[PDB]
């Protein structure tokens, strides 16, 4: 109980003693510890971790105002792709607020270049979700893995649709998901696997757009924060003329009008270039909105 056997990383094994400061709590076997070159004393232990577990448990995003910067917006959630963006600013807004973790699930992690045994990763990662009591899952850009398998799919499509069969077997199969939550983000609400569009999984549907005048005005005011303008202020023309646009791309069009105003290297920016440059550039977005 006082002196035990240690196993060094280099390969040779040794035996050490007990230091008068530490106790027998951490001295139990199965815990990686640290040693000294002189007298082989023990200063403290060394907690194990995945070389990659630090990466999977460290990526963090700060910012607590983003939860209140989403605009006038009062077992699964579908974030589909009508003419309005912000599917990442909101998930990263609450995810940046707390999220209780950073368990991000990228749609490019189900590639499985080798034989399609991704069931070990569905049951492995979802088994981690069932192990850890709190868990929040994000599924961004699911349209790439959301093939409708209308015709006879090849071996590349059959394995992805087989992972979708595991998703069926773990959503409406023999396993409940009352505590875990998944956020299915995508781009086009037409090829979203109508077999998966059952309301048993996706309870509500949130059309990320700018329908309300108060939501477009609110997002316009939170994006129009650090910009300086002339005393003539009129937001009702910008909000009124904008019909069914993208939020972050409305920021890109407004800042594009701020650069259209910086071409004439004027410090103050009148709202004329906002109406005519948001007008014309937004019409170019309507041209490229096919």
């Amino acid at each position: 109980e006082e002196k035990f056997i240690v196993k060094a990383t280099n390969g040779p094994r040794y035996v050490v003693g007990c230091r008068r400061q530490l106790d027998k709590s951490k001295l139990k076997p199965g815990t990686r510890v640290a040693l000294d070159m002189t007298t082989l004393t023990i200063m403290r232990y060394l907690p194990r971790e995945v070389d990659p577990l630090v990466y999977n448990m460290s990526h963090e995003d700060p910012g607590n105002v983003s939860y209140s910067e989403i605009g006038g917006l009062s077992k699964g959630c579908l974030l589909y792709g009508p003419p309005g963006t912000g599917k990442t600013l909101l998930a990263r807004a609450v995810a940046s607020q707390l999220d209780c973790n950073f368990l991000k699930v990228v749609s490019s992690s189900i590639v499985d270049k080798y034989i399609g045994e991704s069931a070990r990763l569905i049951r492995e990662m979802f088994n981690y979700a069932r192990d850890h009591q709190p868990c929040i899952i994000f599924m961004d850009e699911i349209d790439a893995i959301g093939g409708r398998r209308f015709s006879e799919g090849t071996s590349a499509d059959r394995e992805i649709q087989r992972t979708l069969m595991e998703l069926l077997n773990q959503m409406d199969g023999f396993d409940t998901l009352h505590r875990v939550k998944m956020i299915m983000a995508t781009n086009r609400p037409d090829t979203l696997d109508p077999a998966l569009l059952r309301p048993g999984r996706l309870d509500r549907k949130i059309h990320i757009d700018l329908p309300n005048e108060q939501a477009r005005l609110d997002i316009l005011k939170i994006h129009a924060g650090p910009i300086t303008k002339h005393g003539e202020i009129d937001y009702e023309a910008i909000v009124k003329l904008s019909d069914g646009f993208n939020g972050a791309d409305l920021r890109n069009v407004c800042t594009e009008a701020g650069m259209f105003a910086i071409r004439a290297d004027h410090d103050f920016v009148v709202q004329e270039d906002f109406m005519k440059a948001v007008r014309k550039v937004a019409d170019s977005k309507k041209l490229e909105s096919k």
Binding site: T9, N10, A34, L35, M43, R44, L46, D51, V54, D61, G63, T85, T88, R92, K104, V106, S107, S108, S109, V111, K113, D140, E141, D143, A144, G147, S155, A156, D157, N187, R188, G225, P226, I227, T228, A248, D249, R251, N252, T255, G258, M259, I262, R263, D267, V269, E288
Partner: protein, 309 residues
């Protein structure tokens, strides 16, 4: 009595124990290499990032090119937005706080091939004055697994770690295929990884990533974002007027005969591109030497057009 430590690994495959020590650390504490260490005490004194694999680090080490933006003619209405979009984000960083402006990081320089978009984006890279770093599409497809992650994290390792530079890539459409095993799905792992590094990274306000596609047949719908390829300025095939302009400014150095009405060459140049007329200029500069007459004649235009095409 606060807890703070780190795991060390020597080059000789020997693991030791040591806490986080040294001077004031700002960019440190990352899992990197090339750190300072004395003889046997094994302390951390000077940490500096290494980025090993020089085959990817030294991909295209170019300081600055020779050609400038004043070598073309008839494209200022569409290239002026890019010249602004590379000059104002380099010198007017002070005004970016008064106005709250963040420049876009993804610009889509798309159009038909042979338009000289590579040499034109490089011609603007001479005006950027920053470090120019090329990258080819077919370079991501490698024999070993997980190489594309090392190439992408290497590109953002030199762009993130190094000084403000310029990274222009080309032939992105050759690998931007949205297939529904498959290699282009591996390029969807690496590609969607890069898009995740252009979507999940808010500190990406650093060095831009300029891209160019020779065709927009397979257009990835996920390439629409402020940080992603949002600047979509269409670059069509230059007409005989624009081709006579870029061929005139690209041929302003050779001894060209003053009796050029541009009507014969304007008629012969039908559905051509920029680099094709550049090849006609170079070919004329090739046979005009062996023609005996040091002055460029008028038949050399159609002679080169029918020669190489």
């Amino acid at each position: 009595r606060k807890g703070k430590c780190a795991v060390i690994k020597t080059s000789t495959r020997q693991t030791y124990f040591l806490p986080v020590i040294g001077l004031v650390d700002a960019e440190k504490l990352k899992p990197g290499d090339l750190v300072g260490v004395n003889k046997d005490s094994y302390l951390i004194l000077e940490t500096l990032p290494t980025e090993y694999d020089s085959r990817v680090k030294a991909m295209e080490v170019d300081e600055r090119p020779t050609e400038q933006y004043s070598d073309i003619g008839g494209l200022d209405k569409q290239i002026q937005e890019l010249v602004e979009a590379i000059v104002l984000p380099m010198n007017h960083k002070e005004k970016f706080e008064n106005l709250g402006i963040q420049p876009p990081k993804g610009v889509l320089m798309y159009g038909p091939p042979g338009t000289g978009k590579t040499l034109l984006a490089r011609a603007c890279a001479a005006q950027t004055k920053a470090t120019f770093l090329k990258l080819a599409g077919p370079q991501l497809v490698q024999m070993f697994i997980g190489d594309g992650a090392k190439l992408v994290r290497d590109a953002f390792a030199l762009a993130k770690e190094k000084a403000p530079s310029i990274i222009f890539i080309d032939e992105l459409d050759a690998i931007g295929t949205k297939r529904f095993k498959a290699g282009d799905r591996e390029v969807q792992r690496t590609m969607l990884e890069l898009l995740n590094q252009l979507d999940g990274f808010q500190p990406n306000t650093q060095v831009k990533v300029i891209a160019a596609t020779n065709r927009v047949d397979i257009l990835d719908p996920a390439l629409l974002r402020s940080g992603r390829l949002d600047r979509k300025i269409e670059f069509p095939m230059p007409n005989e007027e624009a081709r006579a302009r870029i061929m005139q400014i690209h041929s302003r150095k050779m001894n060209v005969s003053p009796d050029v009405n541009y009507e014969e060459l304007a008629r012969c140049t039908d559905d051509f591109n920029g680099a094709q007329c550049k090849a006609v200029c170079v070919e004329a500069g090739m046979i005009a030497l062996r023609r005996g007459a040091t002055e460029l004649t008028h038949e050399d235009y159609m002679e080169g057009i029918l020669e190489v095409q």
